[PDB]
Design a protein around this ligand. Structure first.
Ligand SMILES: *[C]C1=C([C])[C]=C2C(=[C]1)N([C][C]([O])[C]([O])[C]([O])[C]OP([O])(=O)OP([O])(=O)O[C][C]1O[C](N3[C]=NC4=C3N=[C]N=C4[N])[C]([O])[C]1[O])C1=NC(=O)[N]C(=O)C1=N2/[C]=[C]/[C][N][C]1[C][C]C2=C1[C]=[C][C]=[C]2
Ligand SMILES: *[C]C1=C([C])[C]=C2C(=[C]1)N([C][C]([O])[C]([O])[C]([O])[C]OP([O])(=O)OP([O])(=O)O[C][C]1O[C](N3[C]=NC4=C3N=[C]N=C4[N])[C]([O])[C]1[O])C1=NC(=O)[N]C(=O)C1=N2/[C]=[C]/[C][N][C]1[C][C]C2=C1[C]=[C][C]=[C]2
Lengths: 494, 499
């Protein structure tokens, strides 16, 4: 019945907020729609796989908040395999390489590729992390899709294809679906192109031993009976002295404040009294989540390593069901596996098939790319289509279509009376990730602490000390990378 | 408790569906979230205005379903005033004209303008009304915003400006927000550019005497206690023999079938068991409604008529709060009024101001455009911002951003077990309008009748006889309009003679 704060949503953001408030001495309740915690993270356990992450999984350098929270909960990380060569598969052919970027040999194509990545970071430097709508050219860039930007920037089809794959993989949406301003903000707030795409020294460096689902599970252990499972919130009433929160199974909760720790659009599932202010009312109908199926194919042995392949594949073309893979073998070297993402329109297209039909397509692709008949003999298969989830709406995160970020963006984390907004979408650093979920939950919890007169205003936003276990190398450029001309630049010099 | 069909939503679509089913002999219940029926139609009544439509209002030739329904209910129409001259206000200057289109004098600009409108209709002919995703170039056009299409087509700023205003007015959204394929479908399914923009012989020809809100009100009168007000639906359960429908105030309703007669995205407010199929689950997060404030300024007399202006203004420019007006005077000639729309980004921008501040801005604009000091002395003002409505989401209707219609469009009116889908967004003719609401509601009702084995399959979609009261002139083009070249076409003809 009665408490200090109701937290709506038991994913990482909601759990991190609840933990902070509980540690501060307040009475908290977490209302969770599902029969489990974790939300967009989900660790499946069975004898065949031991454990596998079917949602959010990877962590890396500069993600100091998730690393600190996980460590405090007794969790450890291990390194994703990147010892051997990566593969770039293009026009039906495999090209092995080392380092973060697939090499380019044609001098014109080289100039075009270099300029694209450089320009993305160049543009990003003009976009404030905490206010992308304040970029000098905000409106111009927001009224443009990424597809339009790519058409303007890329003078070769080779650069445009890779850039397109990059967009699809980053935000699980088509280039024509997303705002240019929003996408450039998204990459920038993760630390730039190199940081976001890299395994070693980047976002895909590490996973948690035992799965990321343990973060939410272990906080639930700490909170005990304060977490209420199968309690979808349907109604929030702010007309009286105390806030009233009603669930689908007819329970009523009373609190001084509420944290909404759900994806922005999922706010539509709640009936508000009084009605939301105009801007938020419309915003929450304008912000969809992407489309993805996460697939893991298991093998007797990590056979690709014997051919000096690490298991990373970058696979171009419409025919390929999966555009990107990583080695998903356990740190001990057993439960050999390849993880792949089926992205955007392909997720929608291939969802019509059966599980067995999808397994076959993936194995035939991997056999081709790795040049190995062993890829055709899987021992097990696990997959998850996030598009079908009523209480997620998709994965990995919310994207903004053209025009939306400049018009509605400032309302994302603006409080509505006694409701405060968490969730990874409201973060300013690694928004879209588990790291962003921790930032947003803890920040929202502190906003309430300030509202109660318990902490000063300057303590709402808190910096995080660097992890000693996962240190960050700085991102470097070469002299030639900085000063080599673009294709139109070279033509101008001619 | 128990009935044959639960209808969710008491707007025109839901009421038309309920009436059809009730007339067929079935037990129906309508569950309506608000304390009133009508939805996106709302007629306000007070002594100062007598009556005024604050939502949906205009009807015209080819909208035969709404006209027939209204006539059966005892309603009558009258003609919107278009006796005197229209005004095109551009670059701070007013240019009076006659006919549907503002004239263009510059020969290059003339070619550009002619080609734009022609091309819109040309492209539309390739788009099936009942399946726009089947257009031969569906993907190409869907992966493009209207802004991109305009940039490619319009060789003069003059044509691009007017085309932009046209998009804003049609669908209450910016050119960069909407898919080109969707917008071209939208215009085509209303009968084309001329039909959609015209007063005389078009969509804005007429209004209902006493207001359009009477359509829903009078059906409620016929249904009696079957309409339940202040019953927002929160939960639909389809796991058992009968469908269970739960409301916010904890009432339970049991039925054989459900019609969902709400805007597609408002389906998000309902929790489903079992969960919706994947495609619909994602679709309903991808389909927002537009942004608009409808404003009516009242005067002692229709003074614009004395200057030979009918009251129609097409107003270009960023500074102008209102881009389009019509005479809203009563047919008797009293309660003189100008109706104007504040569109898209301007609706969001000017909502921050007070009512008094907005009134002032409109009057100063009208004084400028009409060249009349009298515009500065209003006697009354009414307005409605539709962006603030929890149970509408916006107005006039749902738009589709780039990429959505080809990927999710086929799921719009696909039944989910025993739930069938009405609402103007699922119509194939005048979708977005009151006409489309009638078509969709009656079609959804007949889908259920077929499911019950009461009618054959070929009776689900029913054609409508033309109104005798509101006849439709055909849309004509001149010889020159059809065969005059575009700007790039003329340049090509110059490149060949000089070779
Ligand atoms: C899905 C996914 C996948 C598949 C993958 C991934 C992901 C995902 N990610 C993301 C994450 O996960 C996120 O961010 C998080 O998790 C979020 O959190 P939050 O904020 O908390 O949210 P959520 O979870 O959702 O929660 C919520 C909750 O709530 C609830 N509800 C609802 N509604 C309601 C409720 N309750 C009550 N009532 C009501 N009404 C629900 O149920 C829930 O629970 C990620 N992340 C990270 O970090 N990592 C990773 O890994 C991930 N993943 C991904 C990634 C990818 N990557 C890739 C590779 C290569 C590359 C890339 C990118 C870029 C570049 C390169
Ligand atoms: C808003 C508006 C305005 C301002 C204006 C206009 C309009 C609108 N429009 C449109 C109409 O109105 C529509 O379409 C209709 O109405 C629709 O119907 P429906 O489908 O039925 O839907 P609604 O109404 O929305 O209903 C629904 C219902 O449901 C309910 N709910 C929700 N949720 C829920 C519920 N219940 C239970 N539960 C739950 N959960 C609600 O409440 C409701 O009731 C129009 N239309 C026509 O026809 N006409 C007109 O006039 C109109 N308007 C407009 C127009 C404009 N125009 C312009 C001028 C010039 C030009 C233009 C365009 C183009 C060209 C030129």
């Amino acid at each position: 019945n009665k408490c200090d704060v109701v937290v709506v949503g038991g994913g990482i953001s909601g759990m991190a907020a609840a933990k902070l408030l509980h540690d501060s001495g307040l009475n908290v309740v977490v209302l969770e729609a599902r029969d489990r915690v974790g939300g967009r993270t989900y660790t499946l356990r069975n004898q065949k796989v031991k454990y596998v992450d079917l949602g959010g999984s990877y962590v890396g350098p500069t993600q100091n908040r998730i690393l600190r929270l996980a460590k405090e909960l007794g969790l450890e990380t291990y390194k994703v395999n990147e010892v051997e060569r990566l593969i770039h598969h293009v026009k039906g052919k495999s090209y092995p390489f080392r380092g973060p970027f697939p090499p380019v040999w044609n001098p014109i194509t080289y100039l075009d590729h270099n300029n694209f990545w450089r320009t993305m970071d160049d543009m990003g430097r003009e976009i404030p992390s905490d206010a992308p709508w304040k970029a000098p050219l905000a409106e111009e860039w927001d009224n443009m899709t990424m597809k339009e930007l790519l058409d303007k920037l890329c003078w070769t089809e080779s650069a445009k294809q890779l850039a397109t794959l990059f967009v699809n993989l980053c935000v699980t949406a088509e280039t024509h679906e997303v705002s240019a301003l929003w996408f450039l903000w998204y990459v920038k707030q993760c630390g730039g192109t190199t940081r976001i795409i890299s395994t070693t020294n980047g976002g895909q460096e590490r996973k948690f031993v035992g799965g990321s689902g343990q973060v939410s599970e272990r906080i639930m252990d700490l909170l005990g009976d304060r977490v209420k499972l199968e309690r979808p919130v349907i109604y929030i009433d702010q007309t009286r002295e105390n806030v009233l929160v009603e669930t689908l199974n007819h329970e009523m909760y009373e609190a001084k404040y509420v944290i909404s720790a759900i994806p922005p659009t999922l706010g539509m599932k709640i009936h508000f009294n009084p009605p939301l202010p105009m801007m938020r009312n419309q915003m929450i109908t304008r912000v969809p989540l992407g489309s993805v199926i996460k697939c893991i194919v298991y093998y007797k042995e990590p056979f690709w390593r014997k051919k000096d392949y690490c298991g990373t594949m970058i696979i171009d073309g419409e025919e390929a069901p999966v555009a990107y893979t990583l080695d998903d073998t356990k740190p001990e070297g057993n439960y050999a596996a390849i993880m792949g993402f089926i992205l955007a329109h392909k997720a929608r297209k291939l969802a019509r098939l059966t599980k067995e039909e999808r397994l076959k397509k993936l194995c035939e692709l991997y056999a081709k790319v790795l040049g190995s008949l062993e890829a055709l003999e899987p021992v097990h298969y696990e997959e998850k289509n996030w598009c079908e989830e009523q209480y997620s709406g998709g994965c990995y995160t919310t994207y903004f279509p053209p025009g939306i970020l400049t018009q509605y963006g400032r309302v994302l984390r603006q409080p509505v009376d006694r409701i405060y907004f968490a969730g990874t979408e409201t973060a300013t650093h690694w928004s879209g990730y588990m790291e962003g979920a921790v930032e947003a939950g803890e920040r929202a919890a502190r906003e309430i602490l300030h509202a109660m007169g318990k902490i000063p205003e300057d303590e709402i936003w808190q910096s995080e000390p660097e992890s000693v276990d996962v240190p960050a190398q700085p991102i470097t450029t070469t002299f030639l990378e900085r000063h080599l001309p673009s294709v139109p630049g070279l033509l101008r010099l001619i």
